[PDB]
Amino acid sequence: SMQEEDTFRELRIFLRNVTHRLAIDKRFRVFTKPVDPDEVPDYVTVIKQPMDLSSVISKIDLHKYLTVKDYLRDIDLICSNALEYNPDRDPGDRLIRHRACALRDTAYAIIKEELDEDFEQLCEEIQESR
Numbered sequence: 001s002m003q004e005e006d007t008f009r010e011l012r013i014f015l016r017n018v019t020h021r022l023a024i025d026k027r028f029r030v031f032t033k034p035v036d037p038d039e040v041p042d043y044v045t046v047i048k049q050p051m052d053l054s055s056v057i058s059k060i061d062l063h064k065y066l067t068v069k070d071y072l073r074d075i076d077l078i079c080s081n082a083l084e085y086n087p088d089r090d091p092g093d094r095l096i097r098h099r100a101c102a103l104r105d106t107a108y109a110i111i112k113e114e115l116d117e118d119f120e121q122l123c124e125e126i127q128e129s130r
């Protein structure tokens with residue numbers, strides 16, 4: 001229905017705003033773009049599903065997220081990719097892991113404060129009905 005399409009449109013508006021707020025935070029600059037395979041040619045070797053905030057915006061725009069749960073799986077992937085690719089005790093790796101965990105915790109805190117649980121429940125119910 002038109003109403004269900006209105007629902008998913010409100011979801012995309014909400015997800016774009018959350019993603020924009022993460023992307024303009026200077027701590028998360030490293031997560032805003034895909035990893036340049038020149039810069040880092042072993043990335044695509046180690047990390048099978050690369051994810052970044054530009055890619056999240058493209059997926060919103062392509063209507064790939066019908067729920068906040070699906071969006072948060074891609075946020076979780078940005079974080080888990082960073083923990084896996086940068087697992088070492090050295091400061092470079094520890095800084096990326098701290099920023100990755102902060103990105104994750106920030107996305108979850110915005111959604112906890114701003115996502116209506118009933119809005120998410122509706123999205124889940126339209127999704128399960130397709």
Ligand SMILES: COCCn1ccc(Br)cc1=O
Nearest residue numbers: 083093094095096097098101
């Ligand atoms: C869940 O992975 C650990 C997350 N974390 C938390 C604090 C610091 Br300091 C570094 C770091 O990596």
Ligand SMILES: [Cl-]
Nearest residue numbers: 027029030095
């Ligand atoms: Cl830096």
